[PDB]
Design a binder for these strands. Structure first.
Ligand SMILES: [Mg+2]
Ligand SMILES: [Mg+2]
Ligand SMILES: [Mg+2]
Ligand SMILES: [Mg+2]
Ligand SMILES: [Mg+2]
Ligand SMILES: [Mg+2]
Ligand SMILES: [Mg+2]
Ligand SMILES: [Mg+2]
Ligand SMILES: [Mg+2]
Ligand SMILES: [Mg+2]
Ligand SMILES: [Mg+2]
Ligand SMILES: [Mg+2]
Ligand SMILES: [Mg+2]
Ligand SMILES: [Mg+2]
Ligand SMILES: [Mg+2]
Ligand SMILES: [Mg+2]
Ligand SMILES: [Mg+2]
Ligand SMILES: [Mg+2]
Ligand SMILES: [Mg+2]
Ligand SMILES: [Mg+2]
Ligand SMILES: [Mg+2]
Ligand SMILES: [Mg+2]
Ligand SMILES: [Mg+2]
Ligand SMILES: [Mg+2]
Ligand SMILES: [Mg+2]
Ligand SMILES: [Mg+2]
Ligand SMILES: [Mg+2]
Ligand SMILES: [Mg+2]
Ligand SMILES: [Mg+2]
Ligand SMILES: [Mg+2]
Ligand SMILES: [Mg+2]
Ligand SMILES: [Mg+2]
Ligand SMILES: [Mg+2]
Ligand SMILES: [Mg+2]
Ligand SMILES: [Mg+2]
Ligand SMILES: [Mg+2]
Ligand SMILES: [Mg+2]
Ligand SMILES: [Mg+2]
Ligand SMILES: [Mg+2]
Ligand SMILES: [Mg+2]
Ligand SMILES: [Mg+2]
Ligand SMILES: [Mg+2]
Ligand SMILES: [Mg+2]
Ligand SMILES: [Mg+2]
Ligand SMILES: [Mg+2]
Ligand SMILES: [Mg+2]
Ligand SMILES: [Mg+2]
Ligand SMILES: [Mg+2]
Ligand SMILES: [Mg+2]
Ligand SMILES: [Mg+2]
Ligand SMILES: [Mg+2]
Ligand SMILES: [Mg+2]
Ligand SMILES: [Mg+2]
Ligand SMILES: [Mg+2]
Ligand SMILES: [Mg+2]
Ligand SMILES: [Mg+2]
Ligand SMILES: [Mg+2]
Ligand SMILES: [Mg+2]
Ligand SMILES: [Mg+2]
Ligand SMILES: [Mg+2]
Ligand SMILES: [Mg+2]
Ligand SMILES: [Mg+2]
Ligand SMILES: [Mg+2]
Ligand SMILES: [Mg+2]
Ligand SMILES: [Mg+2]
Ligand SMILES: [Mg+2]
Ligand SMILES: [Mg+2]
Ligand SMILES: [Mg+2]
Ligand SMILES: [Mg+2]
Ligand SMILES: [Mg+2]
Ligand SMILES: [Mg+2]
Ligand SMILES: [Mg+2]
Ligand SMILES: [Mg+2]
Ligand SMILES: [Mg+2]
Ligand SMILES: [Mg+2]
Ligand SMILES: [Mg+2]
Ligand SMILES: [Mg+2]
Ligand SMILES: [Mg+2]
Ligand SMILES: [Mg+2]
Ligand SMILES: [Mg+2]
Ligand SMILES: [Mg+2]
Ligand SMILES: [Mg+2]
Ligand SMILES: [Mg+2]
Ligand SMILES: [Mg+2]
Ligand SMILES: [Mg+2]
Ligand SMILES: [Mg+2]
Ligand SMILES: [Mg+2]
Ligand SMILES: [Mg+2]
Ligand SMILES: [Mg+2]
Ligand SMILES: [Mg+2]
Ligand SMILES: [Mg+2]
Ligand SMILES: [Mg+2]
Ligand SMILES: [Mg+2]
Lengths: 121, 205, 129, 157, 80, 82
RNA sequence: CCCGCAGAAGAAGCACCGGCUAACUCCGUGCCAGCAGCCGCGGUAAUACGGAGGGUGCAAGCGUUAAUCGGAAUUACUGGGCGUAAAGCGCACGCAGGCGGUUUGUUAAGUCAGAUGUGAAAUCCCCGGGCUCAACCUGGGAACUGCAUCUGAUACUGGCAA
RNA sequence: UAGCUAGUAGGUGGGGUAACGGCUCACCUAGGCGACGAUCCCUAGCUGGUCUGAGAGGAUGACCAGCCACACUGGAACUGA
């Protein structure tokens, strides 16, 4: 407030940080993958959620969720990562793209198969 | 590009008769109209304010045989044009060639008129036209070509048009399959049932 | 400490109307008589004087139609902290042209309606609804 | 001259020794479609009993709105609690482009086309009062003419 | 007429040259408040005619050094 | 050297030339001093076909501007007395 | 681009369906497997998970991801605040700076009016026109909110006197 | 990031430049910029526009058009309008 105060010091616009550091406005990114493992969620949930540490190509080291039932990921295996928080595992703020690269499609799906990378029956 | 599914199903969901399967016979009484949209047809809908807007939009689309991409383009033209946005939406839809060919009586249904336009039968101002979306300008003369003139589908379909209301804005010869589009259609001349206001409400947000 | 005298005039009018008061005394000026007369000429105020030689006191006499006051709202636009000079075509119209905006133009102080026809703009002093 | 309609229904709790008892609140606005508006709150134990209780209060709690043809006279604010509410008259074209609750009150009042927006909080009760505070306040040229004692044409033209 | 500019002198301690401020009362683009902005030019003059703290008229002309493209026209209202 | 030449605009297989006064060194579609009419080879016999403002041509050709092989033919096409 | 041929023949998916948000049942599973944009679903009668049927919405596209603005009056100049929600420096003095009672002057810096030059073309916008229609191309108009100079106006603001 | 700055800031005279100029010299004076942000650091081709927006603004500057810059990296001149 006070028009002279604004002349002297303008409105500093809130530079809201991005949720998903993949850098340079990239849709997806490759990851070599290390340590595929299970983890428990927060409070009202209780499960064994499948997740992996992704060694991204640009330098970053992030965790990414493995959606669907069952996966082929292990030890290494190069995978594709897209943005998206799970909102249950705190820290996990990415998703593995099922179908792309070494990550196969989910076995025996029918409904919603672009998600989970499965071809027609 | 087209619907090409169960056509009378669309009429039950919407409730009113959409003239999709109007055809040779006048009244259907052969679908359990109104009270059977699908399996759960006896379910009375709560039907929100967004619902009634969407139902009214999907009714006007399914009557005229237009998809959302081309229908949303009619709204963008309707807004930029003069007068009222509601009246422009429906005036542009009525000016389509497949719609005019139906209203003349050269097609029992609007899908039949669309195929008739598409298959080099229809001809306007001494020029053949394939496009159902062809905006028929004021003072025009749509007609059928002499090769496909008086074929089996048209003569029977023209006898149906006698039972219809028949628009005032256009005129038909009936002897030699020659039509004449005269003035732009008025709001009060046609329908008096499909609400425009709710379709303007869907797109403005 | 008394930077804008014109805003102070327009508060005494506004607060006098809230109190249901008959007359509103204050220190006079050149710009005070000019604004007060424009309010009178259209018909927000019902008569005024400038009684005094050495220390003049311009007192207005506020108008009331019903129990409600005549001046619905009145506010300073071109305050001294931020002067607001509007162009001929860019002149405002308060309440869609049934309230006035007192505008100091080159041919004396006048209303926004008279400024349009006279063919000039200026410093928009105050909106009066 | 009914033109009655419901804005919002909302269940509300009390809490007692035994447990918590739920009642429902309605919010109906009614009008003739020609410069008469009236919101009515109404509450009851059951849902449909609450709306009849609301519709009864709405009819009696009516306010007059002097409006031009089928639209407002001038751009008008009307603050209430945490709802600012702004709405401009607009021309003969368009329709009511306003939020839900804010456009229930407008359409039944009889304004056919206006610009509008609810700033601040958008509590259905307070925004309906915010509009009616504005529409009650919204004076006409005929009122302004008599208020000053000059002329209807000399003010307008 | 010649396209001159009024301006008050800031300093004249350079030998046959003078630095002159030009107060220009432009308004702020966003906030609409009028700002008192300054334009310090280097100006040429024959001998030490003008001193510190006085109004001066200035004309655009040939560049005669690094900076100092403007040149003196005449003196109006001398130093107090 | 200033030269009066066609610019080539329009869609694929559907040319539309903007006859224009430009410097020889500048590109075909690039810089120019001022455009001076147009040319449409796919116009045919109708209302509009080719327009060429002959008043501005005297300002450039009279001083010292060349006219290209095609634009010189359109000055003959528009004619002086036909 | 036209005309003859043959015969429906060669030519439909993929999201979603607890609320926000248009559309529901049945089996399988049993805080497991999994879903999730936000709230949240699953603990043996799940509309939310998986399948099936049924629907809805788009359809040669559809969804997912990322990216900008919008909604966000959530940096507020138009248009927010600071007793208790985030927010009056612990309280003074004070130069630079921002603002300044009142009446005469007088300039014309601001301000206002006019006028000329310019603000490339395209783009945008409106009325046309041309491609079977559209996108696309295209004629003319308006506009390019500007900047410069030049003439005026003195109410206001500034300056300089008194 | 609070001081930076010695051809630095100005003069007289000579040279040089298509052209004027610390462009460059020799001497003379002691400046000049700086809180209306110099200097230093990080980032960045710029505009007509594009997208968005009720508009103010916010973001952006792929394609078409103007200007600049650069040509394996770092230099220098020759030729020529
Ligand atoms: Mg503010
Ligand atoms: Mg398509
Ligand atoms: Mg299509
Ligand atoms: Mg919107
Ligand atoms: Mg006096
Ligand atoms: Mg005295
Ligand atoms: Mg006196
Ligand atoms: Mg008790
Ligand atoms: Mg809020
Ligand atoms: Mg230089
Ligand atoms: Mg060049
Ligand atoms: Mg030819
Ligand atoms: Mg057959
Ligand atoms: Mg088949
Ligand atoms: Mg079993
Ligand atoms: Mg168990
Ligand atoms: Mg278990
Ligand atoms: Mg287990
Ligand atoms: Mg799902
Ligand atoms: Mg909870
Ligand atoms: Mg259970
Ligand atoms: Mg079961
Ligand atoms: Mg459930
Ligand atoms: Mg769901
Ligand atoms: Mg399910
Ligand atoms: Mg399922
Ligand atoms: Mg279906
Ligand atoms: Mg289906
Ligand atoms: Mg697509
Ligand atoms: Mg897409
Ligand atoms: Mg997004
Ligand atoms: Mg904003
Ligand atoms: Mg945001
Ligand atoms: Mg706040
Ligand atoms: Mg305070
Ligand atoms: Mg606090
Ligand atoms: Mg406080
Ligand atoms: Mg304190
Ligand atoms: Mg202290
Ligand atoms: Mg001051
Ligand atoms: Mg002062
Ligand atoms: Mg004063
Ligand atoms: Mg002062
Ligand atoms: Mg005074
Ligand atoms: Mg006097
Ligand atoms: Mg005088
Ligand atoms: Mg005088
Ligand atoms: Mg004078
Ligand atoms: Mg004079
Ligand atoms: Mg001036
Ligand atoms: Mg002057
Ligand atoms: Mg003068
Ligand atoms: Mg000026
Ligand atoms: Mg001006
Ligand atoms: Mg002007
Ligand atoms: Mg242009
Ligand atoms: Mg724009
Ligand atoms: Mg056409
Ligand atoms: Mg045509
Ligand atoms: Mg054009
Ligand atoms: Mg043009
Ligand atoms: Mg023009
Ligand atoms: Mg332009
Ligand atoms: Mg521009
Ligand atoms: Mg201009
Ligand atoms: Mg100037
Ligand atoms: Mg002047
Ligand atoms: Mg003069
Ligand atoms: Mg005076
Ligand atoms: Mg004064
Ligand atoms: Mg004065
Ligand atoms: Mg040279
Ligand atoms: Mg633009
Ligand atoms: Mg847009
Ligand atoms: Mg827009
Ligand atoms: Mg906005
Ligand atoms: Mg930029
Ligand atoms: Mg940039
Ligand atoms: Mg880009
Ligand atoms: Mg490129
Ligand atoms: Mg290209
Ligand atoms: Mg290229
Ligand atoms: Mg280029
Ligand atoms: Mg250049
Ligand atoms: Mg250059
Ligand atoms: Mg170079
Ligand atoms: Mg080069
Ligand atoms: Mg290269
Ligand atoms: Mg090199
Ligand atoms: Mg080199
Ligand atoms: Mg050579
Ligand atoms: Mg040489
Ligand atoms: Mg040379």
């Amino acid at each position: 407030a006070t028009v002279n105060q604004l002349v002297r010091k303008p409105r500093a616009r809130k530079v809201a940080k991005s949720n998903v550091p993949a850098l340079e406005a990239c849709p997806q990114k490759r990851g070599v993958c290390t340590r595929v493992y299970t983890t428990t969620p927060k409070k009202p949930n209780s499960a064994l959620r499948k997740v992996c540490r992704v060694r991204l190509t640009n330098g970053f080291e992030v965790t990414s969720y493995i959606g669907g039932e069952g996966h082929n990921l292990q030890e290494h295996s190069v995978i594709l990562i897209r943005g998206g928080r799970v909102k249950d595992l705190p820290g996990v703020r990415y998703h593995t793209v099922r179908g792309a690269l070494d990550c196969s499609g989910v076995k025996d799906r029918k409904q919603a198969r672009s998600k989970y990378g499965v071809k027609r029956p | 590009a087209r619907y090409l599914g169960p056509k009378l199903k669309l009429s039950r969901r919407e409730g009113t008769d959409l003239f999709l399967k109007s055809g040779v016979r006048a009244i259907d009484t052969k679908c359990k109209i109104e009270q059977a949209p699908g399996q759960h047809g006896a379910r009375k809908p709560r039907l929100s304010d967004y619902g009634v807007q969407l139902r009214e939009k999907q009714k006007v689309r399914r009557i005229y045989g237009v998809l959302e991409r081309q229908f949303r383009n009619y709204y963008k033209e309707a807004a930029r044009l003069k007068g009222n946005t509601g009246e422009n939406l429906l005036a542009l839809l009525e000016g389509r060639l497949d719609n005019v060919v139906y209203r003349m009586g050269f097609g029992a249904t609007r899908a039949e008129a669309r195929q008739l336009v598409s298959h080099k039968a229809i001809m306007v101002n001494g020029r053949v036209v394939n496009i159902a979306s062809y905006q028929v300008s004021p003072n025009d003369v749509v007609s059928i070509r002499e090769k496909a003139k008086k074929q089996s589908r048209v003569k029977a379909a023209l006898e149906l048009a006698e039972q219809r209301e028949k628009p005032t804005w256009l005129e038909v010869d009936a002897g030699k399959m020659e039509g004449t589009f005269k003035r732009k259609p008025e709001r009060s001349d046609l329908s008096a049932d499909i609400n425009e206001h709710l379709i303007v409400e869907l797109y403005s947000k | 400490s008394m930077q804008d005298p014109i805003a102070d005039m327009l508060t005494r009018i506004r607060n006098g109307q809230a109190a249901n008061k008959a007359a509103v005394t204050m220190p006079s000026s050149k710009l005070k008589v000019a604004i007060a007369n424009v309010l009178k000429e259209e018909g927000f105020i019902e008569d005024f004087k400038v009684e005094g030689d050495t220390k003049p006191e311009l007192e207005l006499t506020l108008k009331y139609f019903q129990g409600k006051a005549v001046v619905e709202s009145i506010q300073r636009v071109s305050r001294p902290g931020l002067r607001i000079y509007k162009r001929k075509d860019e002149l405002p119209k308060v309440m869609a042209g049934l309230g006035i905006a007192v505008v100091s133009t080159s041919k004396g102080v006048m209303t926004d309606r008279a400024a349009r026809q006279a063919g000039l703009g200026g410093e928009i002093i105050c909106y009066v609804a | 001259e009914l033109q009655e309609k419901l804005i919002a229904v909302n269940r509300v709790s009390k809490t007692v020794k035994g447990g918590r008892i739920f009642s429902f609140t309605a919010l109906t606005v009614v009008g003739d479609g020609n410069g008469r508006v009236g919101f009515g709150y109404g509450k009851a134990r059951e849902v449909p009993a609450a709306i009849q209780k609301a519709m009864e209060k709405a009819r009696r709690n009516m306010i007059n709105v002097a409006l031009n043809n089928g639209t407002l006279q001038h751009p008008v604010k009307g603050v209430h609690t945490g709802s600012r509410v702004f709405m401009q008259p607009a021309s003969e074209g368009t329709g009511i482009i306003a939020g839900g609750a804010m456009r229930a009150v407008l359409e039944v009042a009889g304004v056919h086309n206006v610009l509008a927006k609810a700033y601040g909080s958008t509590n259905p009760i307070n925004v309906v009062r915010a509009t009616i505070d504005g529409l009650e306040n919204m004076n006409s040229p005929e009122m302004v003419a008599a208020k000053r004692g000059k002329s209807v044409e000399e003010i307008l033209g | 007429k010649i396209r001159t500019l009024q301006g008050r002198v800031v300093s004249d301690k350079m030998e046959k040259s003078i630095v002159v401020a030009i107060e220009r009362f432009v308004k702020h683009p966003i906030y609409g408040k009028f700002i008192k902005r300054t334009t310090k030019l280097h100006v040429h003059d024959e001998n030490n005619e003008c001193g510190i703290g006085d109004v001066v008229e200035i004309r655009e002309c040939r560049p005669l050094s690094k900076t100092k493209s403007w040149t003196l026209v005449r003196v109006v209202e001398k130093a107090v | 050297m200033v030269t009066i030449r066609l610019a080539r605009h329009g869609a694929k297989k559907r040319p539309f030339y903007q006859v224009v006064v430009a410097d020889s060194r500048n590109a075909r579609n690039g810089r120019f001093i001022e455009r001076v009419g147009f040319f449409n080879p796919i116009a045919s016999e109708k209302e509009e076909g080719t327009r060429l403002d002959l008043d501005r041509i005297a300002h450039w050709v009279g001083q010292g501007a060349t006219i290209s092989d095609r634009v010189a033919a359109l000055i003959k096409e528009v004619n002086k007395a036909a």
